[PDB]
Design a protein around this ligand. Structure first.
Ligand SMILES: CCN(/C=C/N(C)C)C(=O)CNCc1cc(C(=O)O)ccn1
Ligand SMILES: [Mn+2]
Ligand code: NI
Ligand SMILES: [Zn+2]
Length: 454
């Protein structure tokens, strides 16, 4: 009546053989899990990585969260150690319910969270150590440096050690060297009761893998990729403030919204309580949100497989339509992988080859189009050398790589080939096509992938 819990998302309990290879396992579950957006994976009972960080020596400054439904919050933002944060978090939850922490039922915390965010008259604020870079704070998983124990060493090379997943051969980012805003490095989340993550999808519609190392559960809500635009239409009607365009990547607006509201508008929503030692996997373009039941410690990483690759291209097209900034150039990634065709995994090579064929035919059509507009002059340009802010389309903000148009009248400015008319006031003969590759350069790059693929 007040809150109706969404149905449970799928839970998988792989055997050790199934678990050994995460890419194979994630591909196998895709038919089921992509219908729910999120799923939970319980590792085999003996897979128990030991936790390595320290409670007194690592510091962080958490974000302050006002728990108000539909209120705009920025997606990324007093000093605490893990010890002092834990003391604050435990006292908060204990005092809130006047109970011991392990006695507060998860169902009650969930009901209370949704009551609390709905009520104007409540002004409950909490703190969340969110989006902490593993660079500075260190990973919860073992990494090669401190002398590691034999127990720690068993997990250095695990496929489910989140440090390794981005650099394994079946990762399409394995041979990519640009630093990509942390898409290959894990991020940490130090939670307390009611600290929350707003509704969002991942950069470039990537997967995410999320591991709860220890503490009280993390409650999730998830929506399948197929329903993403449904959800966005519901949210735009109820909170249009969130859909006004932002000046950069760091100004993304997000919010808390009751999943019953989505369910009332026929958006499918699934839930789970993720406990210590369990993974949650989010699928491409799968909206998710949630909150922590109490003091806890989680680690997550973006993840990009051969299954994701075609969706990556659709994402950048969607970003262009919305005038939203890219984290990296998808075409640049594809061309980097083509330049390493000889060392790619053969299934990766085959998949890149297919995406490259689409890229080449689209580029051919765009170049024919701008030529018909009277852009005659051209010059090769190594787009990859330019900082991102020097190669964004004036109009749609896409990061250019394959080609762009420049104008001697407006020095430094570029547009992508969809927006030739938006660059400058001057006639078309004053423009120049700047291109990374000739069409004749591209066909052999694609053939190398084909040879590798066999
Ligand atoms: C892969 C980690 N990541 C990238 C970090 N930022 C770009 C800094 C994310 O944005 C993950 N998405 C936010 C989020 C946070 C939580 C959480 O607070 O536990 C759960 C699910 N998703
Ligand atoms: Mn996320
Ligand atoms: Ni437009
Ligand atoms: Zn453009």
């Amino acid at each position: 009546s007040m809150f109706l819990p969404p149905p449970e998302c799928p839970v998988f309990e792989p055997s050790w053989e199934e678990f050994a290879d995460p890419f194979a396992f994630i591909h196998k579950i895709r038919p089921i899990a992509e219908q729910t957006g999120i799923c939970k994976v319980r590792p085999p009972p003996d897979w128990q990585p030991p936790f390595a960080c320290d409670v007194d020596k690592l510091h962080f400054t958490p974000r302050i969260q006002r728990l108000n439904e539909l209120e705009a919050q920025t997606r990324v933002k007093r000093d605490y150690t893990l010890r002092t944060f834990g003391e604050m978090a435990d006292a908060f939850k204990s005092d809130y319910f006047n109970m011991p922490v392990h006695m507060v039922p998860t169902e009650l915390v969930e009901k209370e969270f949704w009551r609390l965010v709905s009520t104007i008259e409540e002004d409950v604020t909490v703190e969340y150590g969110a989006d902490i870079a593993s660079k500075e704070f260190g990973s919860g998983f073992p990494v090669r440096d401190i002398k590691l124990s034999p127990e720690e060493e068993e997990y250095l090379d695990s496929g489910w050690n989140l440090n390794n997943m981005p650099v394994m051969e079946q990762s399409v980012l394995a041979h990519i060297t640009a630093d990509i805003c942390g898409m290959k490095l894990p991020w940490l989340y130090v939670g307390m009761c009611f600290s929350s993550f707003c509704w969002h999808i991942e950069d470039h519609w990537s997967y995410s893998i999320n591991y709860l190392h220890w503490g009280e559960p993390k409650t999730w809500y998830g929506v399948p990729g197929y329903a993403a635009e449904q959800l966005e239409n519901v949210m735009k009607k109820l909170a249009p403030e969130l859909f006004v365009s932002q000046p950069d990547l760091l100004h993304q607006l997000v919010t808390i919204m009751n999943p019953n509201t989505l369910m009332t508008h026929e958006v499918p929503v699934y839930r789970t309580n993720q406990c210590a030692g369990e993974f949650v996997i989010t699928f491409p373009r799968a909206y998710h949100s949630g909150f922590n039941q109490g003091f806890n410690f989680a680690e997550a990483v973006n993840f990009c497989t051969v299954d994701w690759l075609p969706l990556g291209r659709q994402c950048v097209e969607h970003y262009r339509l919305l005038h939203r900034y890219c984290v990296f150039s998808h075409d640049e990634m594809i061309c980097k992988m083509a330049s390493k065709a000889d060392v790619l995994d053969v299934v990766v090579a085959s998949t890149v080859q297919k995406d490259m064929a689409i890229m080449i035919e689209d580029e051919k059509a765009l170049r024919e189009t701008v030529r018909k507009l009277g852009v005659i002059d051209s010059e090769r340009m190594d787009f990859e050398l330019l900082p991102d802010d020097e190669r964004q389309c004036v109009k749609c903000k896409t990061t250019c790589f394959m080609s762009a148009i420049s104008c001697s009248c407006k020095p430094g400015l570029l547009v992508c080939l969809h927006h030739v008319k938006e660059l400058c006031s001057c006639p078309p003969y004053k423009y120049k096509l700047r291109y990374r590759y000739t069409l004749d350069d591209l066909y052999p790059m694609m053939n190398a992938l084909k040879l590798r693929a066999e």
